[PDB]
Design an enzyme around this catalytic site. Structure first.
Site, mmCIF file in Angstrom:
data_model
loop_
_atom_site.group_PDB
_atom_site.id
_atom_site.type_symbol
_atom_site.label_atom_id
_atom_site.label_comp_id
_atom_site.label_asym_id
_atom_site.label_seq_id
_atom_site.Cartn_x
_atom_site.Cartn_y
_atom_site.Cartn_z
ATOM 1 N N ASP A 181 0.824 -1.217 0.000
ATOM 2 C CA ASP A 181 0.000 0.000 0.000
ATOM 3 C C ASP A 181 0.860 1.271 0.000
ATOM 4 O O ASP A 181 0.507 2.262 -0.655
ATOM 5 C CB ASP A 181 -0.930 0.051 1.237
ATOM 6 C CG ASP A 181 -2.321 -0.580 1.029
ATOM 7 O OD1 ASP A 181 -2.593 -1.249 0.020
ATOM 8 O OD2 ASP A 181 -3.185 -0.402 1.940
ATOM 9 N N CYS A 215 -2.450 0.600 -13.501
ATOM 10 C CA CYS A 215 -2.469 0.621 -12.044
ATOM 11 C C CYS A 215 -3.616 1.574 -11.701
ATOM 12 O O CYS A 215 -4.659 1.487 -12.355
ATOM 13 C CB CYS A 215 -1.095 0.992 -11.482
ATOM 14 S SG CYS A 215 -0.277 2.469 -12.248
ATOM 15 N N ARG A 221 3.519 2.489 -10.984
ATOM 16 C CA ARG A 221 3.802 1.054 -11.131
ATOM 17 C C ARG A 221 3.814 0.645 -12.599
ATOM 18 O O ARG A 221 4.664 -0.165 -13.030
ATOM 19 C CB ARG A 221 2.766 0.213 -10.367
ATOM 20 C CG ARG A 221 2.768 0.466 -8.864
ATOM 21 C CD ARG A 221 1.618 -0.246 -8.152
ATOM 22 N NE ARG A 221 1.403 0.352 -6.843
ATOM 23 C CZ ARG A 221 0.426 -0.004 -6.018
ATOM 24 N NH1 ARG A 221 -0.425 -0.956 -6.370
ATOM 25 N NH2 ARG A 221 0.280 0.630 -4.844
ATOM 26 N N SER A 222 2.865 1.176 -13.382
ATOM 27 C CA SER A 222 2.799 0.835 -14.816
ATOM 28 C C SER A 222 4.071 1.252 -15.538
ATOM 29 O O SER A 222 4.568 0.528 -16.422
ATOM 30 C CB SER A 222 1.595 1.513 -15.468
ATOM 31 O OG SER A 222 0.341 0.956 -15.047
ATOM 32 N N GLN A 262 6.666 7.816 -10.523
ATOM 33 C CA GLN A 262 6.032 8.885 -9.741
ATOM 34 C C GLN A 262 6.852 9.364 -8.555
ATOM 35 O O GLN A 262 6.525 10.426 -7.987
ATOM 36 C CB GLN A 262 4.685 8.398 -9.201
ATOM 37 C CG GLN A 262 3.581 8.383 -10.204
ATOM 38 C CD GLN A 262 2.280 7.846 -9.608
ATOM 39 O OE1 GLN A 262 2.171 6.669 -9.248
ATOM 40 N NE2 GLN A 262 1.307 8.714 -9.474
#
Ligand SMILES: CC(=O)N1C[C@@H](CO)[C@@H]2Oc3ccc(Cl)cc3[C@@H]21
Ligand SMILES: CC(=O)N1C[C@@H](CO)[C@@H]2Oc3ccc(Cl)cc3[C@@H]21
Length: 285
Positions: A181, A215, A221-222, A262
């Site tokens: 998370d 994502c 994440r992508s 990110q």
């Protein structure tokens, strides 16, 4: 510089935030006018994450052709990817329309439906064989065929039917279920194992349309997934694998979608994944 020793040099000097801010400063800025039209407000999850006009995927519709999705075309590596946001309640039909029209074999999902107690994307695939889904706005039917649950990821076989023509196709759903998370994984081993399972399925190969990867926003994440895949492929293709420059590859990918990677932690994790992966492809892990 090479990668593994550039890596230790940034760790010892603690400069990951400065490296990452340089990337943000040098990244491309292209228009995203279609994304910002008022009629598309409920088609975007985040107001600051939009596809560029020049690389956006168009739906084959005359009313409204807009979806928050981008084509990332890597010329030297000979790989293409579609990066998209997690589907919204009012875009699940558009999502499967795109999968159909672009002739994709696989969908790669890197988030859970709920994280941090909030919804990160719609429940856009069926959970039971006998309870199929019909998307009336785009005239598609989606059926769960089989499901294989493993410790770090789940693979599903799905049937997508175009109800207008009665044509059917098999879609593979690759769901990485254990990204934490907060932060990034401590080791890249399970993420790399997952990447290799997607590769082995054919979903990234030229005999199919581009894989669809998402994502929640379709950039963090992508971005890590496609950056690691492309860098490893270039290391196999080139005479000198130490010439592969992960920062240059990332800036090339950011010509096609904004914001990829990110955080500085995601940047460090991408380096770690490529470094460890390059040993398994050959023998020194
Ligand atoms: C359907 C099928 O027979 N296969 C075998 C491989 C290509 O022949 C593909 O890899 C996977 C992985 C997971 C699942 Cl459920 C299905 C597949 C595909
Ligand atoms: C290619 C690569 O570097 N890696 C990293 C391994 C863990 O460090 C990953 O899992 C597999 C599994 C099978 C093969 Cl051929 C390659 C791999 C991956």
């Amino acid at each position: 510089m090479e990668m593994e020793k550039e890596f230790e040099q940034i760790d010892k000097s603690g400069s990951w935030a400065a490296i990452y801010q340089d990337i943000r400063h040098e990244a491309s800025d292209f228009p995203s006018r279609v994304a910002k039209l008022p009629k598309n407000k409920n088609r975007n999850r985040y107001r600051d994450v939009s596809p560029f006009d020049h690389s956006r995927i168009k739906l084959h519709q005359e009313d409204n052709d807009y979806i928050n999705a981008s084509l990332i075309k890597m010329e030297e590596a000979q790989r293409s990817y579609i990066l998209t946001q997690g589907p919204l309640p009012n875009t699940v039909g558009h999502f499967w329309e795109m999968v159909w029209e672009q002739k994709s074999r696989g969908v790669v999902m890197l988030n859970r439906v709920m994280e941090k107690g909030s919804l990160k994307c719609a429940q856009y695939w069926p959970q039971k064989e006998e309870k199929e889904m019909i998307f009336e706005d785009t005239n598609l039917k989606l059926t769960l065929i089989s499901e294989d649950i493993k410790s770090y990821y789940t693979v599903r076989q799905l049937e997508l039917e175009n109800l207008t023509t009665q044509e059917t196709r098999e879609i593979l759903h690759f769901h990485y279920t254990t990204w934490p998370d907060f932060g990034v994984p401590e080791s890249p081993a399970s993420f790399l194992n997952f990447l290799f399972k997607v590769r082995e399925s054919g979903s990234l190969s030229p005999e199919h349309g581009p894989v669809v990867v998402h994502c929640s926003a379709g950039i963090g994440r992508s971005g890590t997934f496609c950056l690691a895949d492309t860098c490893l492929l270039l290391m196999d293709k080139r005479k000198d694998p130490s010439s592969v420059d992960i920062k240059k590859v990332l800036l090339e990918m950011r010509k096609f979608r904004m914001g990829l990677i990110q955080t500085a932690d995601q940047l460090r994790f991408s380096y770690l994944a490529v470094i460890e992966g390059a040993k398994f492809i050959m023998g020194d892990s």
